[PDB]
Enzyme design. Sequence first.
Site, PDB file in Angstrom:
ATOM      1  N   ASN A   1      -7.382   9.015  -6.036  1.00  0.00           N
ATOM      2  CA  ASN A   1      -8.215   8.042  -6.733  1.00  0.00           C
ATOM      3  C   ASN A   1      -8.944   8.762  -7.863  1.00  0.00           C
ATOM      4  OD1 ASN A   1      -8.866   6.729  -3.493  1.00  0.00           O
ATOM      5  ND2 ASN A   1      -7.433   5.924  -5.014  1.00  0.00           N
TER       6      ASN A   1
ATOM      7  N   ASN B   1      -8.961   5.451   2.762  1.00  0.00           N
ATOM      8  CA  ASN B   1      -9.638   6.239   1.737  1.00  0.00           C
ATOM      9  C   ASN B   1     -10.585   7.288   2.308  1.00  0.00           C
ATOM     10  OD1 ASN B   1     -11.827   5.147  -1.072  1.00  0.00           O
ATOM     11  ND2 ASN B   1     -10.727   7.056  -0.782  1.00  0.00           N
TER      12      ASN B   1
ATOM     13  N   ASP C   1     -15.553  -4.235   8.894  1.00  0.00           N
ATOM     14  CA  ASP C   1     -16.745  -3.739   8.225  1.00  0.00           C
ATOM     15  C   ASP C   1     -17.492  -4.850   7.489  1.00  0.00           C
ATOM     16  OD1 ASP C   1     -18.225  -1.214   7.848  1.00  0.00           O
ATOM     17  OD2 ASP C   1     -17.787  -1.435   5.710  1.00  0.00           O
TER      18      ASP C   1
ATOM     19  N   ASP D   1     -11.895   8.826  -8.681  1.00  0.00           N
ATOM     20  CA  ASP D   1     -13.195   9.346  -8.258  1.00  0.00           C
ATOM     21  C   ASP D   1     -13.046  10.612  -7.415  1.00  0.00           C
ATOM     22  OD1 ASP D   1     -12.503   8.362  -5.637  1.00  0.00           O
ATOM     23  OD2 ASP D   1     -14.234   7.105  -5.448  1.00  0.00           O
TER      24      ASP D   1
ATOM     25  N   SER E   1     -11.526  10.904  -4.497  1.00  0.00           N
ATOM     26  CA  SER E   1     -11.072  10.625  -3.142  1.00  0.00           C
ATOM     27  C   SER E   1      -9.552  10.487  -3.128  1.00  0.00           C
ATOM     28  CB  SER E   1     -11.696   9.371  -2.521  1.00  0.00           C
ATOM     29  OG  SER E   1     -11.352   8.223  -3.300  1.00  0.00           O
TER      30      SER E   1
ATOM     31  N   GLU F   1       0.840  -1.197   0.000  1.00  0.00           N
ATOM     32  CA  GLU F   1       0.000   0.000   0.000  1.00  0.00           C
ATOM     33  C   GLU F   1       0.874   1.247   0.000  1.00  0.00           C
ATOM     34  OE1 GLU F   1      -2.953   0.389  -0.666  1.00  0.00           O
ATOM     35  OE2 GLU F   1      -3.976  -1.514  -0.245  1.00  0.00           O
TER      36      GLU F   1
ATOM     37  N   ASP G   1      -6.248   8.369  -0.911  1.00  0.00           N
ATOM     38  CA  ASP G   1      -5.844   7.375   0.080  1.00  0.00           C
ATOM     39  C   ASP G   1      -4.648   7.871   0.888  1.00  0.00           C
ATOM     40  OD1 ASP G   1      -7.714   5.674  -1.023  1.00  0.00           O
ATOM     41  OD2 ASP G   1      -6.280   4.256  -1.883  1.00  0.00           O
TER      42      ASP G   1
END
Length: 129
Positions: free
Chosen positions: A46, A59, A101, A48, A50, A35, A52
């Site tokens: 990202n 995120n 989650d 979109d 967003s 990562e 990280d």
Amino acid sequence: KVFGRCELAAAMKRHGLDNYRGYSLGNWVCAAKFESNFNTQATNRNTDGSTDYGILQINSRWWCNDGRTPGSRNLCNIPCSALLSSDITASVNCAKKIVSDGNGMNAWVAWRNRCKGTDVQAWIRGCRL
Ligand SMILES: [Au+3]
Ligand SMILES: [Au+]
Ligand SMILES: [Cl-]
Ligand SMILES: [Cl-]
């Protein structure tokens, strides 16, 4: 901060990540390696919009607030900046929520693609612990 392999393993252990939700320490070190290459200051945008953040590339769409991700949540209740600290406490606390989650560590796409099913104990091989 750029952690060494064993140095990171030890810090993750201190903050209770070892076997958290059944994921051995090597899985967490392996995810951190692909990562962020163990660099706490790592950030990546990202497609979109967003971003990280940090050692585990958490995120802004869901877990932290960076103030520029419209429609996003902040489920860890922290500024994304806190995820870039030399002290990994914030990233671990948030990672604990994320891996809980429902999909375990598959939430980390680099863990699924590069750590799942592999010999992750090699990541902690040799570490004094
Ligand atoms: Au699971
Ligand atoms: Au720590
Ligand atoms: Cl801790
Ligand atoms: Cl630390």
